[PDB]
Amino acid sequence: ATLKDITRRLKSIKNIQKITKSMKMVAAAKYARAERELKPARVYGVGSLIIGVSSDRGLCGAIHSSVAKRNYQEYSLANIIYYSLKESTTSEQSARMTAMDNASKNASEMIDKLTLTFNRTRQAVITKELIEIISGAAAL
């Protein structure tokens, strides 16, 4: 508990919270659009080699870890890949939104706590340093 370190941590968490709140809102927008375009897609897809579908971006909870854990046919093959794809981004954007909501809220809470820890420490150092001076002075 050093006013230096405490400050170092607050510094990096205030940014995290900022970048994390941002990522949440972006996601919730992507999600909103995705949820809608998904309405038709389902009806369409429901109407219609291990292939795993997800994305390139992390920070969406367990989206990836979970999956990891002649003319007529050709056509119905594209329909099924499309469907899975349209379901996937909806799950992904709603999970990144959720994960970033939490992260951001944890950050803020951490912020509130470190700050209060900072003031307790700040007050004790002064008090501590002052009693030390008085003790020395009184002994004379």
């Binding site: 809102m25 919730a28 927008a29 003031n119 700040r122 002064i126």
Partner: protein, 260 residues
């Protein structure tokens, strides 16, 4: 107003006592003329600090954080003379400085022992143009108890704040995902909230020489009714700007007229 001053150049002992002197004066308009005097101590922290300087000079061992051993008594012997006696009452508006932004610092902590309410002036609110720039959710009061202000008063107040709180929530959404997944319901809380925020602003007679506008001293009754109705939904048709800088709701109505 009578002004009593303890300037910063004065020695510890002087900045130490001037709040008592001011107190003396006020006690007269109460114990001699039984009025309801107003006491303004600006700022309550420099009172305490003056106390420590004096203490240190008298060679007494400081206590936690360097303040005086007698921090609590130095404060109590002064704060306690501020009350409602049978003859009248002194009410004190104390400007508070919080050291190190530490609300548990001995100076501030001691001080809240006596406070019955806080008036938080906010730069953010001001930026909304809203004035007085008081924060409706951060400012507080001990007497906001139905057992003290009465259920009506208490409910309106708790109505105004929640709505103001809810809107606060939505604020994030609106800007990002845009103002419309908003429900027949979510769109009303906003509307009203925004009407409320404005209805909470007001023209001061002190600023007439300047705002070229007439000051308003709204009465408590008028206050609770005002907000009661907005909550109620009585002026949902009225427009926002009808409520900006006015007194009683009646003026919100008339402004609307002039605003076609």
């Amino acid at each position: 107003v009578a002004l009593v001053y303890g300037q910063m150049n004065e020695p510890p002992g002087a900045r130490a006592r001037v709040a008592l002197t001011g107190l003396t004066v006020a006690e007269y308009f109460r114990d001699q003329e039984g009025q309801d005097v107003l006491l303004f101590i600006d700022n309550i922290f420099r009172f305490t600090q003056a106390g420590s300087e004096v203490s240190a000079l008298l060679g007494r061992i400081p206590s936690a954080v360097g303040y005086q051993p007698t921090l609590a008594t130095d404060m109590g012997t002064m704060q306690e003379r501020i009350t409602t006696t049978k003859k009248g009452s002194i009410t004190s508006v104390q400007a508070i400085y919080v050291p190190a932004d530490d609300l548990t610092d001995p100076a501030p902590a001691t001080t809240f022992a006596h406070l019955d309410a806080t008036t938080v002036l906010s730069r953010a609110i001001a930026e909304l143009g809203i004035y007085p720039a008081v924060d409706p959710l951060d400012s507080t009061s001990r007497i906001m108890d139905p057992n003290i202000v009465g259920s009506e008063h208490y409910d309106v107040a708790r109505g105004v704040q929640k709505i103001l709180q809810d809107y606060k929530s939505l604020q994030d959404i609106i800007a990002i995902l845009g103002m419309d997944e908003l429900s027949e319901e979510d769109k009303l809380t906003v509307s009203r909230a925004r009407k409320i925020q404005r209805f909470l602003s007001q023209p001061f007679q002190v600023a007439e020489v300047f705002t070229g506008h007439l000051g308003k001293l709204v009465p408590l009754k008028e206050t609770i009714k005002g907000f009661q109705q907005i909550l109620a939904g009585e002026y949902d048709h009225l427009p926002e700007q009808a409520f900006y800088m006015v007194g009683p709701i009646e003026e919100a109505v008339a402004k609307a007229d002039k605003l076609a």
